Amino acid sequence: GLMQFTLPVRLCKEIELFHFDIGPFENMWPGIFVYMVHRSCGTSCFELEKLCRFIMSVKKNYRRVPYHNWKHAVTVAHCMYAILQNNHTLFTDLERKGLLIACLCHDLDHRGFSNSYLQKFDHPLAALYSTSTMEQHHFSQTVSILQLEGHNIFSTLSSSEYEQVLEIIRKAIIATDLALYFGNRKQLEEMYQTGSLNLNNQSHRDRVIGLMMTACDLCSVTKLWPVTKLTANDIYAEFWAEGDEMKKLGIQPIPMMDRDKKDEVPQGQLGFYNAVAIPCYTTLTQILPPTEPLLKACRDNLSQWEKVIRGEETA
Ligand SMILES: C#Cc1cccc(-n2nccc2-c2nn(-c3ccccc3)ccc2=O)c1
Ligand SMILES: [Mg+2]
Ligand SMILES: [Zn+2]
């Protein structure tokens, strides 16, 4: 309990900021995550030796895909960490515990394909779960790893708290189904503007947590421009592979996923910043004002994609 994980000076400072990049050294990502749980939750909350065993089994069940990989998991976990430190008093001891775990586990065993492709390919996981196909799979994997021996990081919670925390994680992981984002923000917008939003309503917390989870999942669009620029190549590599697999079933993919239509990427990014990211971070700042820096960084990047279309910058 007297073994405080430290980070080098530049990391120790830069890690507190929303736009932190976790860097290219895979071997430091576990220490970074533990550093974050320790400052976010306490030295007390988790048994160091169980935690480390959990993190490495989680790492082992992420796959080598261009984007939906172990780096993504830790990135998303970091954004949640930033949100929780800048909104210190709003969240319970259990939420702080489960949300950082939820973010680490949110894309467990992803193969780089959307729910749509599972449905058209007729993947057995689509028989098992008709909506949020991958997201009920990710949660299922979380529970598997939670039930390996020496892996129950939650062993000190009562029966109650254990159910509470796994129900935070489940809901938190389902909420990363972007198809659910749209209704979830339209309802929080309406609750904030008519002043009914009330954080003592457990129904309303769930929604707020779902939006944090979209916020964290999308946070590659909230980094400094050269990190956003270089992550997009990873994002489109998965999209273009999925389009190839679509063409393989005898189906024109949407252009986003057609690697013959690379020319339309920047306009496609504009669409997505306008249609998804900017609305996500607007609504999230209205509900939690200290998250503004996510909105500020998102708009800067929108403005950098505008510059790309005007040929004042190439990609
Ligand atoms: C792979 C992937 C993937 C899946 C979930 C979110 C993100 N993500 N994160 C940051 C930016 C983006 C992003 N998402 N889309 C997107 C558009 C329509 C449906 C779904 C995703 C289009 C362009 C982007 O840049 C990527
Ligand atoms: Mg996902
Ligand atoms: Zn994700």
mmCIF file of C-alpha atoms and ligand atoms in Angstrom:
data_model
loop_
_atom_site.group_PDB
_atom_site.id
_atom_site.type_symbol
_atom_site.label_atom_id
_atom_site.label_comp_id
_atom_site.label_asym_id
_atom_site.label_seq_id
_atom_site.Cartn_x
_atom_site.Cartn_y
_atom_site.Cartn_z
ATOM 1 C CA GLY A 1 0.000 0.000 0.000
ATOM 2 C CA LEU A 2 3.102 2.346 0.356
ATOM 3 C CA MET A 3 4.191 1.735 -3.352
ATOM 4 C CA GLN A 4 3.158 5.033 -5.124
ATOM 5 C CA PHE A 5 3.687 4.567 -8.913
ATOM 6 C CA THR A 6 5.382 7.787 -10.314
ATOM 7 C CA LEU A 7 5.858 8.912 -13.938
ATOM 8 C CA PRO A 8 8.690 10.961 -15.430
ATOM 9 C CA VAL A 9 8.217 14.770 -15.019
ATOM 10 C CA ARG A 10 6.779 15.545 -18.526
ATOM 11 C CA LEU A 11 4.266 12.598 -18.349
ATOM 12 C CA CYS A 12 3.356 13.345 -14.689
ATOM 13 C CA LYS A 13 2.323 16.894 -15.840
ATOM 14 C CA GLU A 14 0.997 16.183 -19.380
ATOM 15 C CA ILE A 15 -1.163 13.209 -18.076
ATOM 16 C CA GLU A 16 -3.547 15.617 -16.218
ATOM 17 C CA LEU A 17 -4.494 17.316 -19.522
ATOM 18 C CA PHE A 18 -7.380 16.035 -21.784
ATOM 19 C CA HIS A 19 -5.083 15.969 -24.914
ATOM 20 C CA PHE A 20 -2.353 13.701 -23.438
ATOM 21 C CA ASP A 21 -1.000 11.096 -25.927
ATOM 22 C CA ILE A 22 0.091 7.885 -24.067
ATOM 23 C CA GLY A 23 3.069 7.495 -26.472
ATOM 24 C CA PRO A 24 4.567 4.604 -28.490
ATOM 25 C CA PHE A 25 5.993 2.453 -25.602
ATOM 26 C CA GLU A 26 3.394 -0.359 -25.051
ATOM 27 C CA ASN A 27 5.366 -1.418 -21.899
ATOM 28 C CA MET A 28 4.486 1.846 -19.989
ATOM 29 C CA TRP A 29 0.676 1.737 -20.688
ATOM 30 C CA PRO A 30 -0.022 -0.564 -17.651
ATOM 31 C CA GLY A 31 1.977 1.674 -15.279
ATOM 32 C CA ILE A 32 0.156 4.706 -16.774
ATOM 33 C CA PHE A 33 -3.242 3.021 -16.120
ATOM 34 C CA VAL A 34 -2.304 2.093 -12.493
ATOM 35 C CA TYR A 35 -1.015 5.661 -11.887
ATOM 36 C CA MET A 36 -4.509 6.871 -13.032
ATOM 37 C CA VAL A 37 -6.608 4.406 -10.921
ATOM 38 C CA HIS A 38 -4.374 5.334 -7.903
ATOM 39 C CA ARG A 39 -4.947 9.138 -8.275
ATOM 40 C CA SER A 40 -8.636 8.688 -9.399
ATOM 41 C CA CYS A 41 -9.926 6.141 -6.880
ATOM 42 C CA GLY A 42 -7.249 5.724 -4.142
ATOM 43 C CA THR A 43 -4.258 3.422 -3.397
ATOM 44 C CA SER A 44 -6.888 1.487 -1.303
ATOM 45 C CA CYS A 45 -9.632 0.625 -3.903
ATOM 46 C CA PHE A 46 -7.794 -2.282 -5.692
ATOM 47 C CA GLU A 47 -5.226 -4.920 -4.598
ATOM 48 C CA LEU A 48 -2.081 -4.137 -6.672
ATOM 49 C CA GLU A 49 -1.225 -7.847 -7.537
ATOM 50 C CA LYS A 50 -4.854 -8.630 -8.698
ATOM 51 C CA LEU A 51 -5.137 -5.344 -10.672
ATOM 52 C CA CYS A 52 -1.857 -6.078 -12.569
ATOM 53 C CA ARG A 53 -3.085 -9.629 -13.373
ATOM 54 C CA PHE A 54 -6.446 -8.162 -14.669
ATOM 55 C CA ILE A 55 -4.748 -5.455 -16.861
ATOM 56 C CA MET A 56 -2.493 -8.054 -18.577
ATOM 57 C CA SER A 57 -5.346 -10.543 -19.287
ATOM 58 C CA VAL A 58 -7.325 -7.576 -20.707
ATOM 59 C CA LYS A 59 -4.271 -6.567 -22.798
ATOM 60 C CA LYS A 60 -4.028 -10.211 -24.052
ATOM 61 C CA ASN A 61 -7.740 -10.209 -25.233
ATOM 62 C CA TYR A 62 -7.313 -7.044 -27.362
ATOM 63 C CA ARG A 63 -6.211 -7.994 -30.888
ATOM 64 C CA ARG A 64 -3.687 -6.564 -33.386
ATOM 65 C CA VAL A 65 -6.137 -4.393 -35.419
ATOM 66 C CA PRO A 66 -5.189 -0.938 -36.755
ATOM 67 C CA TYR A 67 -7.435 1.129 -34.352
ATOM 68 C CA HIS A 68 -9.700 -0.952 -31.946
ATOM 69 C CA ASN A 69 -6.637 -2.181 -30.049
ATOM 70 C CA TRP A 70 -4.906 -2.037 -26.623
ATOM 71 C CA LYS A 71 -3.638 1.583 -27.296
ATOM 72 C CA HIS A 72 -7.303 2.680 -27.921
ATOM 73 C CA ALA A 73 -8.379 1.059 -24.593
ATOM 74 C CA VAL A 74 -5.785 2.985 -22.572
ATOM 75 C CA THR A 75 -6.413 6.269 -24.502
ATOM 76 C CA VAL A 76 -10.178 6.050 -23.709
ATOM 77 C CA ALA A 77 -9.411 5.122 -20.057
ATOM 78 C CA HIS A 78 -7.163 8.226 -19.872
ATOM 79 C CA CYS A 79 -9.909 10.596 -21.149
ATOM 80 C CA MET A 80 -12.348 9.197 -18.508
ATOM 81 C CA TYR A 81 -9.521 9.794 -15.921
ATOM 82 C CA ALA A 82 -9.227 13.451 -17.050
ATOM 83 C CA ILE A 83 -13.057 13.875 -16.881
ATOM 84 C CA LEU A 84 -13.163 12.364 -13.354
ATOM 85 C CA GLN A 85 -10.328 14.587 -11.939
ATOM 86 C CA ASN A 86 -11.922 17.832 -13.338
ATOM 87 C CA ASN A 87 -15.366 16.754 -11.867
ATOM 88 C CA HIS A 88 -13.937 15.559 -8.484
ATOM 89 C CA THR A 89 -17.054 15.734 -6.215
ATOM 90 C CA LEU A 90 -19.866 14.772 -8.726
ATOM 91 C CA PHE A 91 -19.117 10.962 -8.710
ATOM 92 C CA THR A 92 -19.447 8.137 -6.106
ATOM 93 C CA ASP A 93 -16.551 5.834 -5.007
ATOM 94 C CA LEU A 94 -18.099 2.906 -7.036
ATOM 95 C CA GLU A 95 -18.539 4.954 -10.279
ATOM 96 C CA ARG A 96 -14.845 6.096 -10.225
ATOM 97 C CA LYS A 97 -13.830 2.389 -9.801
ATOM 98 C CA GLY A 98 -16.125 0.883 -12.494
ATOM 99 C CA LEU A 99 -15.845 3.645 -15.148
ATOM 100 C CA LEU A 100 -12.007 3.385 -15.453
ATOM 101 C CA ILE A 101 -12.391 -0.444 -15.743
ATOM 102 C CA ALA A 102 -15.329 0.048 -18.183
ATOM 103 C CA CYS A 103 -13.113 2.217 -20.476
ATOM 104 C CA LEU A 104 -10.220 -0.321 -20.393
ATOM 105 C CA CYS A 105 -12.640 -3.176 -21.286
ATOM 106 C CA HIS A 106 -14.988 -1.297 -23.659
ATOM 107 C CA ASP A 107 -13.624 -2.812 -26.973
ATOM 108 C CA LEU A 108 -12.431 -6.222 -25.637
ATOM 109 C CA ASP A 109 -11.769 -8.768 -28.485
ATOM 110 C CA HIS A 110 -12.808 -6.332 -31.286
ATOM 111 C CA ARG A 111 -11.921 -7.608 -34.827
ATOM 112 C CA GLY A 112 -12.173 -4.174 -36.573
ATOM 113 C CA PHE A 113 -15.739 -4.757 -37.926
ATOM 114 C CA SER A 114 -19.011 -2.843 -37.171
ATOM 115 C CA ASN A 115 -22.246 -4.453 -35.867
ATOM 116 C CA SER A 116 -23.630 -3.991 -39.474
ATOM 117 C CA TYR A 117 -20.986 -6.330 -40.967
ATOM 118 C CA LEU A 118 -21.673 -9.034 -38.300
ATOM 119 C CA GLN A 119 -25.392 -8.842 -39.326
ATOM 120 C CA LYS A 120 -24.776 -9.050 -43.113
ATOM 121 C CA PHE A 121 -22.045 -11.766 -42.715
ATOM 122 C CA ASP A 122 -24.527 -13.538 -40.350
ATOM 123 C CA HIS A 123 -21.893 -13.860 -37.516
ATOM 124 C CA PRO A 124 -23.043 -16.186 -34.670
ATOM 125 C CA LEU A 125 -22.689 -13.239 -32.216
ATOM 126 C CA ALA A 126 -25.588 -11.559 -34.190
ATOM 127 C CA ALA A 127 -27.869 -14.562 -33.478
ATOM 128 C CA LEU A 128 -26.968 -14.247 -29.756
ATOM 129 C CA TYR A 129 -27.512 -10.393 -29.534
ATOM 130 C CA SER A 130 -29.676 -8.592 -32.200
ATOM 131 C CA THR A 131 -28.676 -5.025 -30.965
ATOM 132 C CA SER A 132 -25.341 -3.670 -29.596
ATOM 133 C CA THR A 133 -23.867 -6.965 -30.925
ATOM 134 C CA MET A 134 -20.157 -6.169 -30.286
ATOM 135 C CA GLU A 135 -20.966 -4.199 -27.065
ATOM 136 C CA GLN A 136 -22.732 -7.173 -25.323
ATOM 137 C CA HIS A 137 -19.761 -9.292 -26.542
ATOM 138 C CA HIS A 138 -17.237 -6.761 -24.997
ATOM 139 C CA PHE A 139 -19.123 -6.834 -21.638
ATOM 140 C CA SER A 140 -19.291 -10.671 -21.724
ATOM 141 C CA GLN A 141 -15.473 -10.768 -22.169
ATOM 142 C CA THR A 142 -15.073 -8.325 -19.199
ATOM 143 C CA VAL A 143 -17.095 -10.750 -17.001
ATOM 144 C CA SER A 144 -14.965 -13.751 -18.281
ATOM 145 C CA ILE A 145 -11.721 -12.084 -17.244
ATOM 146 C CA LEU A 146 -13.342 -10.948 -13.945
ATOM 147 C CA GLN A 147 -13.997 -14.712 -13.214
ATOM 148 C CA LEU A 148 -10.501 -16.118 -13.930
ATOM 149 C CA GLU A 149 -8.665 -17.016 -10.700
ATOM 150 C CA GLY A 150 -6.749 -14.195 -8.932
ATOM 151 C CA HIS A 151 -8.526 -11.683 -11.321
ATOM 152 C CA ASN A 152 -11.511 -10.534 -9.106
ATOM 153 C CA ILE A 153 -10.295 -6.944 -8.435
ATOM 154 C CA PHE A 154 -13.757 -6.275 -6.823
ATOM 155 C CA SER A 155 -13.440 -9.062 -4.168
ATOM 156 C CA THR A 156 -13.660 -6.558 -1.185
ATOM 157 C CA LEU A 157 -17.140 -5.234 -2.251
ATOM 158 C CA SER A 158 -20.331 -6.648 -0.583
ATOM 159 C CA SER A 159 -22.652 -8.764 -2.803
ATOM 160 C CA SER A 160 -24.628 -5.382 -3.335
ATOM 161 C CA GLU A 161 -21.775 -3.117 -4.413
ATOM 162 C CA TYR A 162 -20.440 -5.928 -6.680
ATOM 163 C CA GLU A 163 -23.858 -5.967 -8.539
ATOM 164 C CA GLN A 164 -24.010 -2.091 -8.536
ATOM 165 C CA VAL A 165 -20.452 -1.800 -9.977
ATOM 166 C CA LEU A 166 -21.029 -4.568 -12.703
ATOM 167 C CA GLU A 167 -24.309 -2.783 -13.679
ATOM 168 C CA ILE A 168 -22.320 0.538 -14.032
ATOM 169 C CA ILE A 169 -19.796 -1.360 -16.227
ATOM 170 C CA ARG A 170 -22.521 -3.112 -18.329
ATOM 171 C CA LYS A 171 -24.514 0.068 -19.052
ATOM 172 C CA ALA A 172 -21.240 1.998 -19.517
ATOM 173 C CA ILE A 173 -20.039 -0.541 -22.143
ATOM 174 C CA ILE A 174 -23.440 -0.715 -24.023
ATOM 175 C CA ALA A 175 -23.397 3.137 -24.271
ATOM 176 C CA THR A 176 -20.283 2.917 -26.587
ATOM 177 C CA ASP A 177 -22.722 1.640 -29.275
ATOM 178 C CA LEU A 178 -22.733 4.917 -31.262
ATOM 179 C CA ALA A 179 -26.242 3.968 -32.648
ATOM 180 C CA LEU A 180 -27.540 4.639 -29.036
ATOM 181 C CA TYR A 181 -25.525 7.934 -28.659
ATOM 182 C CA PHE A 182 -27.991 9.930 -30.856
ATOM 183 C CA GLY A 183 -31.171 9.329 -28.774
ATOM 184 C CA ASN A 184 -29.145 9.588 -25.550
ATOM 185 C CA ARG A 185 -27.791 13.145 -26.310
ATOM 186 C CA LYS A 186 -31.207 14.330 -27.820
ATOM 187 C CA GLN A 187 -32.776 13.418 -24.396
ATOM 188 C CA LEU A 188 -30.034 15.029 -22.222
ATOM 189 C CA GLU A 189 -30.164 18.194 -24.438
ATOM 190 C CA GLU A 190 -33.987 18.323 -23.800
ATOM 191 C CA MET A 191 -33.553 17.611 -20.028
ATOM 192 C CA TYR A 192 -30.873 20.332 -19.528
ATOM 193 C CA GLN A 193 -32.705 23.070 -21.548
ATOM 194 C CA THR A 194 -36.084 22.456 -19.774
ATOM 195 C CA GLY A 195 -34.009 22.360 -16.475
ATOM 196 C CA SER A 196 -35.386 18.847 -15.478
ATOM 197 C CA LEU A 197 -31.849 17.296 -15.511
ATOM 198 C CA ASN A 198 -31.354 15.971 -11.915
ATOM 199 C CA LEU A 199 -28.181 13.959 -10.923
ATOM 200 C CA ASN A 200 -30.049 12.274 -7.950
ATOM 201 C CA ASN A 201 -32.287 10.485 -10.518
ATOM 202 C CA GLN A 202 -30.226 7.261 -11.136
ATOM 203 C CA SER A 203 -32.037 7.226 -14.589
ATOM 204 C CA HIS A 204 -30.337 10.614 -15.383
ATOM 205 C CA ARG A 205 -26.834 9.611 -14.110
ATOM 206 C CA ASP A 206 -26.967 6.538 -16.469
ATOM 207 C CA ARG A 207 -27.586 8.878 -19.465
ATOM 208 C CA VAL A 208 -24.775 11.327 -18.298
ATOM 209 C CA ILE A 209 -22.351 8.338 -17.920
ATOM 210 C CA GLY A 210 -23.375 7.097 -21.431
ATOM 211 C CA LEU A 211 -22.388 10.539 -22.836
ATOM 212 C CA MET A 212 -19.063 10.574 -20.938
ATOM 213 C CA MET A 213 -18.460 7.076 -22.554
ATOM 214 C CA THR A 214 -19.186 8.453 -26.073
ATOM 215 C CA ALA A 215 -16.954 11.471 -25.181
ATOM 216 C CA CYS A 216 -14.073 9.193 -24.115
ATOM 217 C CA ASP A 217 -14.484 6.733 -27.022
ATOM 218 C CA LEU A 218 -14.318 9.621 -29.593
ATOM 219 C CA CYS A 219 -11.457 11.510 -27.893
ATOM 220 C CA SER A 220 -8.939 10.968 -30.788
ATOM 221 C CA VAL A 221 -10.809 13.985 -32.341
ATOM 222 C CA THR A 222 -9.915 16.074 -29.152
ATOM 223 C CA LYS A 223 -6.082 15.688 -29.382
ATOM 224 C CA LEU A 224 -3.492 18.028 -30.899
ATOM 225 C CA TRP A 225 -3.850 18.028 -34.737
ATOM 226 C CA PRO A 226 -0.881 15.729 -35.644
ATOM 227 C CA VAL A 227 -2.250 12.992 -33.265
ATOM 228 C CA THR A 228 -5.802 13.403 -34.760
ATOM 229 C CA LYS A 229 -4.323 13.368 -38.313
ATOM 230 C CA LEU A 230 -2.296 10.126 -37.612
ATOM 231 C CA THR A 231 -5.142 8.327 -35.707
ATOM 232 C CA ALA A 232 -7.527 8.911 -38.708
ATOM 233 C CA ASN A 233 -5.218 6.715 -40.953
ATOM 234 C CA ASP A 234 -5.725 3.914 -38.366
ATOM 235 C CA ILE A 235 -9.490 4.553 -38.238
ATOM 236 C CA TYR A 236 -9.874 4.440 -42.053
ATOM 237 C CA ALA A 237 -7.646 1.308 -42.358
ATOM 238 C CA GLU A 238 -10.362 -0.556 -40.364
ATOM 239 C CA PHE A 239 -13.130 1.079 -42.405
ATOM 240 C CA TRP A 240 -11.499 0.196 -45.780
ATOM 241 C CA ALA A 241 -10.869 -3.456 -44.675
ATOM 242 C CA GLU A 242 -14.573 -3.697 -43.680
ATOM 243 C CA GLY A 243 -15.583 -2.267 -47.091
ATOM 244 C CA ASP A 244 -13.364 -4.881 -48.752
ATOM 245 C CA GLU A 245 -15.214 -7.583 -46.695
ATOM 246 C CA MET A 246 -18.533 -5.977 -47.746
ATOM 247 C CA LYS A 247 -17.534 -6.065 -51.492
ATOM 248 C CA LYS A 248 -16.677 -9.752 -50.802
ATOM 249 C CA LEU A 249 -20.338 -10.513 -49.731
ATOM 250 C CA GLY A 250 -21.570 -8.749 -52.970
ATOM 251 C CA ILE A 251 -22.517 -5.322 -51.430
ATOM 252 C CA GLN A 252 -21.336 -1.773 -52.426
ATOM 253 C CA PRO A 253 -20.099 -0.373 -49.102
ATOM 254 C CA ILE A 254 -20.988 3.211 -48.117
ATOM 255 C CA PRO A 255 -18.160 5.502 -49.442
ATOM 256 C CA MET A 256 -16.589 6.095 -45.913
ATOM 257 C CA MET A 257 -15.621 2.366 -46.156
ATOM 258 C CA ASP A 258 -14.767 2.333 -49.940
ATOM 259 C CA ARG A 259 -10.933 2.573 -50.226
ATOM 260 C CA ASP A 260 -11.431 3.576 -53.918
ATOM 261 C CA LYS A 261 -13.064 6.831 -52.491
ATOM 262 C CA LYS A 262 -10.065 8.055 -50.324
ATOM 263 C CA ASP A 263 -10.569 11.514 -52.044
ATOM 264 C CA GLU A 264 -13.825 12.020 -49.904
ATOM 265 C CA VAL A 265 -12.158 11.406 -46.473
ATOM 266 C CA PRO A 266 -11.768 15.110 -45.450
ATOM 267 C CA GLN A 267 -15.433 15.959 -46.392
ATOM 268 C CA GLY A 268 -16.436 12.666 -44.562
ATOM 269 C CA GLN A 269 -14.536 13.902 -41.443
ATOM 270 C CA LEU A 270 -16.394 17.302 -41.675
ATOM 271 C CA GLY A 271 -19.711 15.391 -41.769
ATOM 272 C CA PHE A 272 -18.739 13.357 -38.687
ATOM 273 C CA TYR A 273 -17.388 16.390 -36.676
ATOM 274 C CA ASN A 274 -20.654 18.308 -37.487
ATOM 275 C CA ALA A 275 -23.017 15.264 -37.165
ATOM 276 C CA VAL A 276 -21.469 13.547 -34.017
ATOM 277 C CA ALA A 277 -18.351 14.918 -32.247
ATOM 278 C CA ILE A 278 -19.207 18.663 -31.900
ATOM 279 C CA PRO A 279 -22.758 17.867 -30.625
ATOM 280 C CA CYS A 280 -21.360 15.216 -28.152
ATOM 281 C CA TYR A 281 -18.858 17.698 -26.622
ATOM 282 C CA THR A 282 -21.254 20.742 -26.687
ATOM 283 C CA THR A 283 -23.957 18.810 -24.701
ATOM 284 C CA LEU A 284 -21.211 17.282 -22.419
ATOM 285 C CA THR A 285 -19.799 20.763 -21.526
ATOM 286 C CA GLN A 286 -23.386 22.035 -20.772
ATOM 287 C CA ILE A 287 -23.770 19.158 -18.240
ATOM 288 C CA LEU A 288 -20.087 19.159 -16.939
ATOM 289 C CA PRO A 289 -18.546 22.599 -17.676
ATOM 290 C CA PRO A 290 -14.889 21.662 -16.777
ATOM 291 C CA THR A 291 -14.862 19.322 -19.903
ATOM 292 C CA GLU A 292 -14.854 22.477 -22.149
ATOM 293 C CA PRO A 293 -11.218 21.761 -23.163
ATOM 294 C CA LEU A 294 -12.618 18.645 -25.074
ATOM 295 C CA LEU A 295 -15.017 20.964 -26.975
ATOM 296 C CA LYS A 296 -12.249 23.539 -27.612
ATOM 297 C CA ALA A 297 -9.854 20.857 -29.014
ATOM 298 C CA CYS A 298 -12.648 19.222 -31.132
ATOM 299 C CA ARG A 299 -13.454 22.598 -32.845
ATOM 300 C CA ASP A 300 -9.720 23.301 -33.563
ATOM 301 C CA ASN A 301 -9.573 19.916 -35.326
ATOM 302 C CA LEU A 302 -12.791 20.630 -37.275
ATOM 303 C CA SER A 303 -11.038 23.845 -38.370
ATOM 304 C CA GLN A 304 -7.895 21.794 -39.360
ATOM 305 C CA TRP A 305 -10.101 19.499 -41.576
ATOM 306 C CA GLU A 306 -11.583 22.650 -43.215
ATOM 307 C CA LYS A 307 -7.949 23.743 -44.039
ATOM 308 C CA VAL A 308 -7.324 20.289 -45.617
ATOM 309 C CA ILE A 309 -10.271 20.728 -48.080
ATOM 310 C CA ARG A 310 -9.064 24.259 -49.082
ATOM 311 C CA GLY A 311 -5.682 22.653 -50.060
ATOM 312 C CA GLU A 312 -3.960 25.021 -47.422
ATOM 313 C CA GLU A 313 -2.777 21.691 -45.837
ATOM 314 C CA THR A 314 -2.396 18.160 -47.442
ATOM 315 C CA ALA A 315 -2.959 14.667 -45.881
HETATM 316 C C1 LIG B 1 -13.330 2.588 -36.905
HETATM 317 C C2 LIG B 1 -13.985 3.244 -36.132
HETATM 318 C C3 LIG B 1 -14.769 4.044 -35.189
HETATM 319 C C4 LIG B 1 -15.892 3.590 -34.432
HETATM 320 C C5 LIG B 1 -16.505 4.486 -33.566
HETATM 321 C C6 LIG B 1 -15.991 5.790 -33.479
HETATM 322 C C7 LIG B 1 -14.913 6.220 -34.226
HETATM 323 N N1 LIG B 1 -14.280 7.467 -34.185
HETATM 324 N N2 LIG B 1 -13.527 7.908 -33.118
HETATM 325 C C8 LIG B 1 -13.046 9.096 -33.427
HETATM 326 C C9 LIG B 1 -13.462 9.469 -34.720
HETATM 327 C C10 LIG B 1 -14.221 8.424 -35.168
HETATM 328 C C11 LIG B 1 -14.922 8.354 -36.470
HETATM 329 N N3 LIG B 1 -16.047 7.642 -36.545
HETATM 330 N N4 LIG B 1 -16.671 7.603 -37.685
HETATM 331 C C12 LIG B 1 -17.863 6.875 -37.766
HETATM 332 C C13 LIG B 1 -18.836 7.290 -38.699
HETATM 333 C C14 LIG B 1 -20.041 6.602 -38.786
HETATM 334 C C15 LIG B 1 -20.274 5.529 -37.912
HETATM 335 C C16 LIG B 1 -19.306 5.120 -36.977
HETATM 336 C C17 LIG B 1 -18.094 5.796 -36.897
HETATM 337 C C18 LIG B 1 -16.262 8.229 -38.821
HETATM 338 C C19 LIG B 1 -15.131 8.967 -38.884
HETATM 339 C C20 LIG B 1 -14.428 9.077 -37.689
HETATM 340 O O1 LIG B 1 -13.430 9.755 -37.696
HETATM 341 C C21 LIG B 1 -14.310 5.342 -35.060
HETATM 342 MG MG MG B 2 -16.683 -0.087 -29.718
HETATM 343 ZN ZN ZN B 3 -13.912 2.235 -28.559
#
